[PDB]
A paper describes a structure:
In summary, we generated conditional antibodies whose binding affinity to a target antigen is modulated by a small molecule. In this specific case, we selected MTX, an FDA-approved drug, and CD33, a well-studied and validated antigen for AML therapies, to highlight the application of the conditional antibody technology to [name] T cells. In order to determine if the molecular mechanism of MTX binding in the VHH was maintained after pairing it with an antibody light-chain variable domain, we determined the structures of a conditional scFv in the absence and presence of MTX using anti-CD33 scFv P02_D09, a highly MTX-sensitive scFv. We demonstrated how these antibodies can be used to generate conditional [name] T cells with target-specific cytotoxicity whose activity can be reversibly attenuated by the addition of a small molecule to potentially mitigate therapy-associated toxicities.
In addition, the VH:VL interface seen in both the apo and MTX-bound scFv structures are similar to the VH:VL interface in the structure of parental M2J1 antibody. Mutation of select amino acids of the VHH framework back to the parental M2J1 sequence successfully restore the VH:VL interface with sidechain positions essentially superimposable between structures.
Residue numbers in the entry: 1 to 74, 77 to 119, 144 to 253
Write the structure that this text describes.
Amino acid sequence: QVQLVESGGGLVQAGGSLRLSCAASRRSSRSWAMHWVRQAPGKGLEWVAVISYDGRLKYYADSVKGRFTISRDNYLVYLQMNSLRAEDTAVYYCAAEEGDGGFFDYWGQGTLVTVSSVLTQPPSASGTPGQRVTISCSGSSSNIGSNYVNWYQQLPGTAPKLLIYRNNERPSGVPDRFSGSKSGTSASLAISGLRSEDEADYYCAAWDGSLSGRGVFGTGTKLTVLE
Ligand SMILES: [K+]
Ligand SMILES: [K+]
């Protein structure tokens, strides 16, 4: 298993610059791309940029275009952040994408950047142990209507994990209690037999076929279990 380690975070004044590093423990022919995903404290996930294994493909979110630059060096991937703003304050993760599975197949630990001065989901959901809970994801023709859906689970203070890829497929280690589906421009995550460990945030995800710099992540759903 490849291990990813982010570094470079710290305190910076607005307008300043900072370079983050994503280090991979070893090369892998399965991993073809490396993403950066950030999360402001208490907010949702936001995809930042991606670079292919050979550096020839690079894409950025519109919220960082022109200010951020992704690059790599032979086992390191760099994110050069210029003209930093308070909105850029977030934990920055890097995540590799393999030739199968989902957009973000494994993740690092995160590095915090502090700058000193659309897929809609229900904000919250709940259930009792053993209950069946469904989480909706409402998109458009350009994203869900045109591309596969992913689902990601995030426990408090930890990096998210891939739950569902290719609309309805589970990676290894995901129980069959989780299932996904997609119809038209909407998608849904279903959790049968809700367990206490399922209390987490859940994000749907789908790439946009028109203007891909818009965003990939859903708004996120906080699921609480009433014991
Ligand atoms: K590689
Ligand atoms: K993948």
